[PDB]
Curated annotation (Swiss-Prot):
Gene Ontology BP, a term: siroheme biosynthetic process
Name this polypeptide is given: Sirohydrochlorin ferrochelatase
GO molecular function, one term: metal ion binding
PANTHER family (UniProt xref): SIROHYDROCHLORIN FERROCHELATASE, CHLOROPLASTIC (PTHR33542:SF3)
One Pfam family in the UniProt entry: CbiX
Keyword Lipid biosynthesis on entry: no
Cited InterPro entries: CbiX-like, Sirohydro_Cobaltochel/CbiX
Natural source organism: Bacillus subtilis (strain 168)
Keywords, alphabetical: Iron, Lyase, Metal-binding, Porphyrin biosynthesis
Enzyme class: lyase
Binding-site list for Fe cation: H9, H75
Length: 254
């Protein structure tokens, strides 16, 4: 009767496809919902159309669409809802709820914490550089800053400086240029990203480049599908499925 339609962003790099698919499959066993399908916005199938239609043939009357996204931007606001409306127009009897990206959640702050500790370097009063992809949509910068504020307050770090790969400032290269110094403060670099690929690889080169000036800089792995990221995402899934007040009812918002 009830369905979950998971939507990942999709990748063309084989490794990212496998990581995202494996994560969503391991999500299925935590949700007591009889119909559950995975799908991806782009570059990777099953498509949103395919997964939605799969939900319908297994008899779903209600579909809770939950996006696997760290942050809220054009993908969350437009692309996914547009695909949802396109496929859902063909099934007006199917009720739809639409969840939020993980966004500002204490669990993701815990994921950043475990990535920092994994480096094995003392963390007290240390600087953290939180690199998000970035977007021209201000909600992205706002949410990464909110995540930075929660981490800053919860762990006795010096500060957490959000910066971005593209589209909005400060660019991580500006911070890096300001980090050529070497002041004895240990620098953790945490990529606030779900997948590896070229941008993760360029940051890797940049962390070596930065380390050439200031040896007290250490790049952690990107957060990825950390268990605490998984906890936060399952919260998103459960709240979309519960829909206890109808607040996630999907008004066709392309
Ligand atoms: Co995209
Ligand atoms: Co599990
Ligand atoms: Co459009
Ligand atoms: Co923990």
């Amino acid at each position: 009767k009830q369905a979950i339609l998971y939507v990942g962003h999709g990748s063309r790099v084989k490794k990212a496809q496998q990581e995202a698919a494996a994560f969503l499959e391991g999500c299925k066993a935590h949700i007591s919902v009889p119909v559950q399908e995975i799908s991806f916005l782009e570059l990777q199938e099953p498509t949103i159309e395919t997964g939605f239609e799969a939900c319908v043939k297994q008899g779903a009357t209600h579909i809770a669409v939950v996006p696997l996204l760290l942050l809220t931007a054009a993908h969350a606001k437009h692309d996914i809802p547009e695909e949802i409306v396109r496929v859902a127009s063909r099934y007006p009897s199917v009720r739809i709820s639409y969840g939020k990206p993980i966004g500002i959640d204490e669990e993701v702050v815990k994921a950043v914490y475990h990535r920092m500790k994994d480096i094995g370097v003392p963390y007290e009063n240390a600087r953290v550089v939180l690199i998000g992809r970035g977007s021209s949509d201000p909600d992205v910068k706002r949410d990464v800053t909110g995540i930075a504020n929660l981490l800053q307050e919860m762990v006795p770090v010096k500060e957490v400086i959000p910066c971005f790969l593209t589209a909005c400032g400060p660019n991580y290269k500006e911070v890096f240029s300001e980090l050529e110094k070497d002041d004895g403060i240990t620098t953790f670099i945490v990529p606030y990203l779900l997948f590896t690929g070229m941008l993760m690889n360029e940051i890797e080169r940049e962390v070596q480049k930065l380390k050439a000036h200031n040896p007290n800089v250490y790049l952690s792995s990107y957060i990825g599908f950390h268990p605490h990221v998984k906890n936060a995402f399952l919260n998103r899934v459960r709240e979309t499925a519960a829909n206890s007040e109808g607040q996630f009812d999907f008004d066709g918002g392309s």
